[PDB]
Design a protein around this ligand. Structure first.
Ligand SMILES: CCCCCCCCCCCCCCCC(=O)OC[C@H](CO[C@@H]1O[C@H](CS(=O)(=O)O)[C@@H](O)[C@H](O)[C@H]1O)OC(=O)CCCCCCCCCCCCCCC
Ligand SMILES: CCCCCCCCCCCCCCCC(=O)OC[C@H](COP(=O)(O)OC[C@@H](O)CO)OC(=O)CCCCCCCCCCCCCCC
Ligand SMILES: CCCCCCCCCCCCCCCC(=O)OC[C@H](COP(=O)(O)OC[C@@H](O)CO)OC(=O)CCCCCCCCCCCCCCC
Ligand code: FES
Lengths: 252, 150, 677, 93, 128
């Protein structure tokens, strides 16, 4: 919930008390918040391979995925802000379940850094598959809510009336380098912590797998991600009308 | 884990990025990765119902009634639509189910994995919170090793 | 036509049942569903057969009536979105649907026994069913949204399938690379389809084909921006079809199973990179400079696909580089605008190289009984040696496949490449003679692949090399009761106990007494020979042989659906030349149809091996360093990103967390100072 | 729904365009059913035999449920052996 | 003339069960691959086909030969032999990267060709 819902106040706040309370000043500040978010995605996706730790990797992952919300907020569009709210909810589910699985993986393995903690997929296969599916959801992979979020924000950029093509090209380019760098750190985490074989861990450990409670946690946070990836209007439809009530304050 | 002695520092911090797996020189293919294991002949029967109910029975703390209501709850909400449309009845019944489940989950067994880590010394079966209402046993101070063997 | 296309929304989602039931089965009740080990297999094959039947009927209705059905629905309706997920059933879709369904069914039948000795075996079919669903949704795709959707889902299934054996770290590096490469391609695909929504505001194929015919006559759209957007839109196909920049994922994708080496490429997924270009040709021929770009990428990666496979000691990597060459041939054919010859080349290649990969897997599982399980042994083409004697059906299958790649005219598929070169040689001088040279090289390395495996002695039980086989055979000596009671522990027999003494030299005997202790015989004396694989591995190979023999005769139906003998004999001359250069080297002397008087003069003219000691050296260096492109990327692209990551986390932890922590350090310090002053 | 579209290049297109939506109420109802499923699972699987956090592996060594129990344990058991060592030296090793 | 005395024990034992020693005379030290190829003894084995080996540079691990009684006149391992083979009994050198010395050289190096696909272990006396 520090990443699930506590990180979203501040993103939601930039919508309430900044976007519809101070609109003519947001029209001055959002051009720079855009550059900040575009640099934020790359910065927080390049720091994450720098982290040997497992949990700090996902913390920086959250710093990276908040960049799309910053961008959708600074996108003076209906698609941009709808993608920001959708990414609030999507990354809520994703980061919540990812930190949950990293904590349970630390409790099972009692190792933190990715230099140690080699192949643990045969030890904890349920945790392996849930972590892989939620890394795919963090990856903006279609069939998950992260894709439609990190695509509707792009679409709000390219359909923006505030910005011009000389800037839209640079912004989209620096945004979509983020989705090259995000595979790098997420699948680096996966191949470091799960893919491999450690000869000293053969049978004498025989760690316990994901119990039914933890499996229900991960699955229960997964099913809205899948359901929103296959039908996004579980999240757009509750906000989009209100988003127009925001943007009606911006165009005139 | 335990590490009663201090562990040995590894003189080879293998790398910031590459995984901690063994090299392909020492990798016995087939047997490790399971690409040539699973010779059918050591497998067992239990075709999909003798191993589902076995797994449900493997992980369950549900008694006859608590558990029956668990099996009949989600079918009740699934028939809350496509058979009728009650409305607030569904939520009132779901709250009733949650509260009666929580009252039932004040289980007569206490299962000492529920208790604090400091309790695990030995002989904890003689401790019986299961029957003794108003236990009155000042052992949760956790600053001195009292002899609670009486 | 009236109602059968209303049910065109199922051909993606008919397989999806069994991966859905496996992902909730293997994840929640793994014992129970793995108890149904073989039933999910037949269920997957049956559902893929339903989709095969439906796609065959759709192809029949496509060739009957000339129309395209676009049964779009509405995904989301909030603002400019108005998203759809419809199915653009055109001739190209129908081709891709049959090409996916047939090869997927046959590869599933293949994996029924290839993976029967696999511990995690049902998750393989979960991945395969999801892969087939994802590709069937990719090709049945009305807008770039759904194309993109299933593009990245294909990347996901490629990652999972390549890292299917997650335990071996080489597969981990393979799958991480594959997904990173596919996403370097999908980067381009995303900021190309968004550039198309800028230039057109379309997110559909019905409108794009009706806009781009007249869009380039306007003034606001910059032609530089259009070619930039088109190149970025092609970068996706560059990655999926393994073209020159993003080709590194394919020869390293062999670390997974062989069935996926038949389905990932020579099949659905690399066919997707060709499908997208074939579908966007109506808006690539109009843009001026993108077509030359596609032709140049294809003609660079037909020789990077060819000069790489000349000396790959592995079977699957050589076939993968051959696939990388044939996909470049297809991208060249699209670069020539030949909308039909590229797809016929794709069909014959995906029914020939898939056959070759299934034959390679049967070769491999024949070889595991020899050398155990080791891809440096059980896939090492050199010590495959001779398998014509042992595995004849697989021999005929692999022979028909390789001869289909070389372009043999009567009993194989030359006519695809015939149309390729016929539409290519009167276009440009650069992209014609080098294409023919790479065709000759294709004949050479493919027949080398065939000859090093099948024709000859076994090279692993060979009694000139394998001393274990010799020690197992000669269970008794050649003297009976004489010369010994048996001898093990033979000493340094430098004089052979023949009363021989040395002349003026450095030394003859010394304190070096080394007992060359030999092994024993009459122990594990069986050493079985490679027997043929099971019948469910042969049946896919037989059906694919029937295909690539039936495809070789396909009054033409290139117009209905979508220097003749001089060019033919010239192409057959260069192909037979490559065949002959492979034959005179790799075919042994006791089985070659050539005359011994010529075969001896071959080595007599080349007994020096000095001009060949540089050519062979450079070709092997090329094939072993992988063109040095993998080394360049792993020195300047992923190591560059790793240096940048260490630099950025330094900047974060030291000198922007340094300020945040220096606030507190300075507060502590001023507190202690103003406490003590 | 059915539209025939002429295009110069390739062929004709027979677009169908079933514009639909789940609807405002059904979206609320699937939110309802999923929250009820979350209730059911939170209670039932919460009342399941969590095999890891019950045994002497987790609950034995420390097992409070924190993330610092490992580090404070391996920082305390050095202190406990040092204290037992001082007690041993108190009575002549 | 300065003649280095090679032996070149084959890996396959004879049908008698005894190894075969061939005693190639080739003069000087340039490269053991070029010596075994000029003097026509089996170095590669199944990699003896043209493109099945790197043909001298050292990029493959194919021309590896177990050399015993060869601490006298060799070049040391050139970090390609130390890397392209990593876990071997350390008597195994690549013939095209190793070098038996200079023209003015005499010695009795015995080099078991094809150490892979062999039955014997050679029981080298323990060093030092
Ligand atoms: C979609 C619905 C998601 C519900 C979550 C189901 C869940 O995770 O529990 C799965 C467990 C079995 O898990 C466990 O069952 C087995 C436990 S044991 O080791 O055999 O004892 C074991 O296979 C493994 O740990 C695990 O799968 O069984 C259930 O309680 C399912 C209840 C009915 C649904
Ligand atoms: C719409 C989009 C929604 C779906 C997107 C698909 C998500 C990817 C699933 C990735 C599973 C990989 C993770 C993976 O490798 O799991 C490995 C794990 C091990 O299961 P096995 O039964 O193979 O285990 C025995 C082996 O461990 C011995 O080698 O298998 C699973 O749990 C099956 C999951 C298949 C799910 C499909
Ligand atoms: C406001 C000024 C900071 C005052 C107090 C301050 O120095 O913080 C104190 C804090 C560390 O102090 P603590 O005593 O919490 O140290 C942790 C210890 O409890 C054991 O590790 O420093 C920070 O973490 C940096 C705070 C930056 C805050 C911005
Ligand atoms: S021949 Fe390649 S290593 Fe000597």
């Amino acid at each position: 919930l520090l990443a699930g819902i506590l990180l979203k106040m501040g993103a939601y706040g930039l919508v309430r008390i900044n976007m519809e309370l101070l609109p003519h000043a947001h029209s001055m500040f959002s051009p720079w918040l855009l550059v900040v978010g575009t640099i934020q995605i790359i910065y927080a996706a390049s720091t994450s391979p720098g982290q040997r730790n497992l949990k700090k990797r996902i913390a920086y992952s959250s710093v990276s995925h908040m960049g799309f919300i910053i961008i959708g907020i600074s996108s003076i569009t209906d698609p941009g802000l709808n993608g920001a709210i959708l990414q609030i909810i999507s990354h809520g589910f994703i980061g919540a379940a990812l930190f949950f699985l990293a904590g349970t993986s630390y409790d099972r393995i009692r190792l933190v850094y990715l230099d140690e903690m080699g192949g643990m997929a045969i030890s904890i296969p349920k945790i392996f598959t849930m972590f892989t599916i939620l890394s795919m959801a963090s990856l903006a992979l279609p069939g998950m809510s992260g894709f439609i979020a990190e695509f509707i924000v792009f679409f709000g950029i390219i359909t923006s009336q505030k910005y011009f093509l000389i800037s839209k090209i640079f912004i989209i380019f620096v945004m979509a380098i983020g989705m090259i760098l995000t595979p790098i750190y997420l699948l680096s985490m996966l191949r470091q912590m799960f893919y491999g074989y450690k000869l000293i861990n053969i049978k004498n450990f025989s760690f316990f797998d994901s119990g039914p409670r933890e499996l229900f946690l991960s699955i229960s946070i997964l099913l809205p991600i899948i359901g929103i990836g296959i039908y996004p209007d579980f999240v757009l439809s509750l906000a989009s009308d209100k988003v127009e009530s925001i943007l009606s304050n911006y165009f005139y | 884990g335990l590490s009663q002695i201090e562990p040995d520092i590894n003189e080879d911090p293998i790398g910031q990025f590459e995984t901690n797996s063994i090299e392909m020189e020492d990798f016995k293919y087939g047997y490790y990765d399971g690409a040539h294991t699973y010779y059918e002949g050591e497998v067992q029967k239990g075709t999909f119902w003798g191993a589902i109910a076995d797994d449900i029975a493997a992980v369950d703390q549900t008694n006859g009634f608590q558990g029956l209501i668990s099996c009949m709850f989600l079918p009740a909400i699934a028939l809350g639509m496509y058979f009728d449309a009650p409305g607030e009845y569904l939520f009132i019944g779901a709250a009733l189910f949650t509260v009666v489940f929580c009252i039932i989950e004040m289980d007569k067994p206490d299962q000492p994995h529920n208790f604090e880590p400091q309790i695990y010394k030995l002989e904890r079966g003689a401790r019986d919170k299961l029957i003794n209402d108003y236990n009155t046993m000042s052992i949760w101070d956790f600053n001195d090793k009292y002899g609670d063997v009486w | 036509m009236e109602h059968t296309y209303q049910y065109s929304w199922i051909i993606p989602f008919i397989p999806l049942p069994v991966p859905i039931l496996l992902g909730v089965g293997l994840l929640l009740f793994p014992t129970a569903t793995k108890n149904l080990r073989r039933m999910w297999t037949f269920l997957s094959i049956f559902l893929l057969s339903i989709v095969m039947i439906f796609s065959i009927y759709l192809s029949i209705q496509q060739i009957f009536l000339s129309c395209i059905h676009q049964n779009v629905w509405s995904w989301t309706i909030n603002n400019e979105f108005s998203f759809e997920f419809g199915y653009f059933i055109d001739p190209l879709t129908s081709i891709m649907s049959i090409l996916i369904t047939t090869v997927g069914i046959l590869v599933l039948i293949y994996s029924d026994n290839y993976m029967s000795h696999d511990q995690g075996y049902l998750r393989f079919f979960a991945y395969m069913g999801f892969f087939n669903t994802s590709m069937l949704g990719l090709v049945t795709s009305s807008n770039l949204i759904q194309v993109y959707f299933f593009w990245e889902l294909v990347g996901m299934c490629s990652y999972l399938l390549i890292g299917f054996w997650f335990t071996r770290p080489i597969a981990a590096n393979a799958c991480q690379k594959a997904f990173v490469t596919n996403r370097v391609g999908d980067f381009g695909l995303l900021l190309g389809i968004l550039g198309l929504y800028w230039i057109t505001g379309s997110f559909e194929f019905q409108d794009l084909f009706e806009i781009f015919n007249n869009l380039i006559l306007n003034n606001r759209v910059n032609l530089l921006f259009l070619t930039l957007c088109a190149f970025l839109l092609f970068v996706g196909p560059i990655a999926k079809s393994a073209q020159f920049p993003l080709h590194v994922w394919l020869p390293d994708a062999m670390e997974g199973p062989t069935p996926i080496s038949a389905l990932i490429h020579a099949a659905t997924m690399v066919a997707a990179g060709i499908f997208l270009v074939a579908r966007l040709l109506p808006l690539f021929i109009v843009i001026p400079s993108i077509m030359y770009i596609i032709s140049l990428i294809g003609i660079i990666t037909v020789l990077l696909g060819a000069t790489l496979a000349l000396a790959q000691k592995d079977i699957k990597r050589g076939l993968a580089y051959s696939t990388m060459s044939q996909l470049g041939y297809m991208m060249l054919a699209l670069g020539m605008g030949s909308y039909r010859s590229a797809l016929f080349h794709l069909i014959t290649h995906a029914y020939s190289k898939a056959l070759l990969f299934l034959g390679s897997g049967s070769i491999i599982h024949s070889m595991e009984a020899i050398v155990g399980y080791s891809p440096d042994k059980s896939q090492n083409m050199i010590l495959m040696g001779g398998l014509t004697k042992h595995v004849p059906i697989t021999k005929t299958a692999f022979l028909i496949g390789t001869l289909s790649l070389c372009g043999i005219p009567p009993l194989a598929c030359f006519w695809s490449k015939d149309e390729i070169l016929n539409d290519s040689l009167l276009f440009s001088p650069i992209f014609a003679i080098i294409a023919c040279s790479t065709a000759g090289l294709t004949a050479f390395y493919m027949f080398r692949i065939y000859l090093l495996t099948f024709e000859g002695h076994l090279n692993t039980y060979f009694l000139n090399y394998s001393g274990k086989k010799s020690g197992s055979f000669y269970s008794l000596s050649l003297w009976g009761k004489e010369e010994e009671k048996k001898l093990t522990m033979n000493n340094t027999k430098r004089a052979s106990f023949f009363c021989n003494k040395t002349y003026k030299i450095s030394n003859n005997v010394r304190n070096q007494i080394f007992i060359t202790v030999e092994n024993f015989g009459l122990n594990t004396r069986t050493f079985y020979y490679p027997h043929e694989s099971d019948n469910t591995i042969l049946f896919p190979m037989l059906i694919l042989v029937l295909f690539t023999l039936f495809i070789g005769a396909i009054n033409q139906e290139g117009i209905d659906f979508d220097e003749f003998l001089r060019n033919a004999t010239f192409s057959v001359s260069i192909a037979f030349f490559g065949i002959f250069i492979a034959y005179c080297l790799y075919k042994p002397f006791y089985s070659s149809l050539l005359n011994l008087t010529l075969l001896n003069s071959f080595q007599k003219w080349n007994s020096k091996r000095i001009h060949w000691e540089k050519l062979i050296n450079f070709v092997y260096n090329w094939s072993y360093n992988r063109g040095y492109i993998d080394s360049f990327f792993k020195t300047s692209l992923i190591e560059s990103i790793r240096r940048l990551a260490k630099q950025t986390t330094f900047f974060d932890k030291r000198i922007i967390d340094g300020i945040t922590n220096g606030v507190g350090i300075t507060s502590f310090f001023v507190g202690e100072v103003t406490k003590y002053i | 729904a059915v539209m025939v579209q002429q295009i110069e290049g390739m062929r004709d297109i027979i677009t169908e365009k079933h514009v639909w939506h789940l609807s405002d109420k059904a979206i609320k109802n699937v939110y309802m059913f999923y929250i009820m499923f979350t209730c059911w699972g939170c209670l039932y699987f919460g009342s399941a035999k969590d095999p890891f956090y019950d045994s002497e592996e987790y609950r034995g060594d420390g097992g409070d449920g924190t993330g610092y129990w490992v580090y404070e344990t391996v920082c305390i058991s050095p202190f406990l052996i040092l204290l037992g060592k001082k007690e041993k030296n108190l009575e002549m090793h | 003339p300065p003649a280095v005395d090679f032996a070149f024990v084959h890996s396959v034992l004879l049908p008698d069960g005894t190894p075969d020693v061939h005693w190639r005379r080739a003069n000087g030290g340039q490269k053991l691959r070029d010596i075994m190829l000029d003097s026509n003894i089996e170095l590669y084995g199944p990699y003896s086909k043209p493109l099945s080996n790197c043909a001298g540079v050292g990029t493959c691990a194919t021309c590896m030969v177990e050399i015993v009684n060869g601490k006298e006149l060799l070049n040391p391992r050139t970090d390609i032999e130390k890397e392209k083979l990593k876990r071997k009994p350390k008597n195994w050198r690549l013939a095209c990267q190793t070098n038996v010395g200079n023209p003015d050289s005499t010695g009795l190096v015995v080099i078991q060709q094809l150490p892979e696909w062999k039955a014997h272990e050679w029981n080298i006396p323990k060093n030092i």
